[PDB]
Design a protein around this nucleic acid. Structure first.
Ligand SMILES: Cc1cc2c(cc1C)N(C[C@H](O)[C@H](O)[C@H](O)COP(=O)(O)OP(=O)(O)OC[C@H]1O[C@@H](n3cnc4c(N)ncnc43)[C@H](O)[C@@H]1O)c1[nH]c(=O)[nH]c(=O)c1N2
Length: 457
DNA sequence: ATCGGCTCGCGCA
DNA sequence: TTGCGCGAAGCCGA
């Protein structure tokens, strides 16, 4: 293993007890550097490795769609891990409180966790550091190149981040070793799933006839299913990807984001498999740029800008520009609730909101348009930001993610973009138009697909 | 230093 | 639709 993937959070003397991998971002047993590091620490100390996962109350802020997807994955993971004689413990409550107590009760010798740049994880990590006396390590298992190694500062643009990342790819793009089962031999999911579903039922998104909007058959959860999705992408869609990625009437994306978000598949694995596939060099290049440069610069953004979900993290040129247009008359102003229900004047905007409500995965091209029109038809840039984050995290399966905050900040605040022609309301922020979409794809077919969904509560 | 080059709309063929 | 050249625009880094 490359040691630059590990960072020490707290030093100390190893205990005589097991190695505890506090799993949080990377919910998978294969292709997982955090779990492979924990197992190796355990092997040379001659103790078992165990996995712990803390189910927090944050699920109440999203929907059944994300909760079920994640919990069904965990049910499959629990079996996979137990097949390698690795027990998994599912705690309920505040990780700051619960992880400390678990380490004490269970007499852990060493604590390991995976890496996320979101604020709340760093808050928990500092709470855990105060509650423990054993060594504490962090492993970047989500990025190909460890986030603190790729760059030491906020990267202004993809083209400044690209060479830094590619300079390190020969070193860090490598195969994964096998997870060795435990040799030393060492609250109930289903109850948790059923209890949480009952808590969320009053907030389910429903049609007029009381049927749920959400269609759960577009993405089967879990590690096994994720691998099939990757394989059928390489086999059927990667060749057309470069030419058709921006056409929402074609189902030509990898569809991997719900699995990448929950860590049910490793993007390093996807990159390995795509690198070795014989297909169109332009498609491979377009796809590797998205899953390497744009995904990992989103961790760069959140990790070096703690206010990544706020106006104040925009570049100065964009703050100045949007400020100067704060008093311009908006052509329309919608509330959160009229956006949410798809009640704007624009049938193409409404159709993308319908795709979001019913599938939980809006086409990537439409996310740019969707977010830019929220800025255009809301009373202020801060309200636009609020509305865009709220609908993104409530309804996207891949939401509550660095990629989301960075994509919204790109769309509304020009983060990782540049300045364009000055307009009213949106200032110098890059503009997108309904007529622009019409030159690029059959807008009418996309609208027609989602039209019959004004059947809304 | 100093300038080439970055993930839209629109006219046109 | 399809590709191209152009426009308007601020700034990083060889
Ligand atoms: C306003 C807005 C809002 C969001 C996002 C972008 C924008 C403009 N995205 C990013 C992107 O739209 C999304 O990852 C893909 O549409 C996911 O679909 P596929 O995996 O099929 O894409 P596709 O197969 O094209 O891409 C493969 C992977 O590359 C990465 N990638 C692609 N486009 C990216 C982008 N613009 N930024 C960062 N990484 C990118 C993602 O990991 C994606 O899963 C996002 N993504 C996400 O994971 N969670 C979210 O909440 C959102 N929400």
């Amino acid at each position: 293993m490359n040691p630059k993937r590990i960072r020490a959070l707290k030093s100390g003397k190893q205990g005589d007890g097991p190695v505890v991998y506090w799993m949080s971002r990377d919910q998978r047993a294969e292709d997982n550097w955090a779990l492979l590091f924990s197992r190796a620490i355990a092997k040379e100390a001659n103790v078992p490795v165990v996995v712990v996962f803390c189910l927090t109350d944050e699920f109440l802020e999203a929907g059944i769609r994300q909760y079920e997807f994640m919990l069904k994955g965990l049910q499959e993971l629990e079996v996979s891990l137990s097949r390698k004689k690795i027990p998994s413990f599912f705690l309920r409550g505040d990780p700051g409180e619960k992880i400390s107590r678990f380490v004490k009760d269970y007499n852990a010798g060493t604590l390991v966790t995976d890496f996320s740049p979101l604020r709340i994880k760093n808050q928990w990590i500092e709470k855990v550091i105060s509650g423990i006396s054993i060594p504490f390590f962090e492993v970047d298992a989500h990025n190909v190149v460890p986030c603190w190694e790729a760059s030491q500062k906020h990267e202004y643009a993809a083209h400044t981040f690209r060479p830094k990342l590619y300079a390190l790819l020969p070193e860090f793009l490598e195969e994964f070793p096998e997870l060795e089962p435990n040799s030393v031999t060492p609250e109930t999911l289903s109850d948790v799933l059923e209890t949480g579903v009952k808590a969320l039922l009053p907030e389910r998104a429903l049609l007029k006839n009381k049927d749920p909007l959400f269609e759960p058959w577009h993405f089967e959860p879990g590690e096994k299913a994720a691998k099939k999705v990757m394989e059928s992408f390489i086999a059927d869609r990667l060749d057309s990807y470069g030419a058709l990625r921006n056409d929402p009437t074609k189902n030509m994306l990898s569809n991997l984001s719900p699995y990448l978000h929950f860590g049910q598949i490793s993007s390093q694995r996807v990159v390995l498999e795509v690198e070795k596939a014989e297909s169109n060099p332009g498609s491979k290049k377009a796809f590797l740029d998205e899953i390497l440069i744009w995904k990992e610069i989103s961790d760069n953004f959140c990790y070096y800008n703690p206010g990544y979900d706020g106006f104040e993290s925009f570049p100065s040129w964009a703050k100045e520009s949007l400020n100067a247009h704060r008093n311009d008359v908006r052509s329309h102003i919608y509330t959160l609730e009229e956006f949410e229900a798809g009640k704007t004047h624009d049938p193409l905007w409404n159709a993308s909101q319908m795709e979001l409500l019913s599938t939980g995965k809006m086409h990537g091209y439409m996310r740019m348009y969707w977010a830019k029109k929220i800025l255009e038809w809301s009373e202020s840039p801060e309200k636009a930001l609020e509305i865009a984050i709220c609908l993104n995290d409530r309804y996207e399966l891949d939401g509550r993610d660095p990629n989301g905050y960075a994509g919204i900040a790109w769309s509304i605040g020009g983060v990782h973009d540049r300045a364009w022609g000055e307009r009213e309301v949106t200032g110098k922020i890059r503009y997108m138009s309904y007529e622009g979409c019409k030159r690029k794809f059959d807008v009418k077919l996309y609208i027609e697909k989602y039209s019959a969904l004004d059947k809304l509560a």
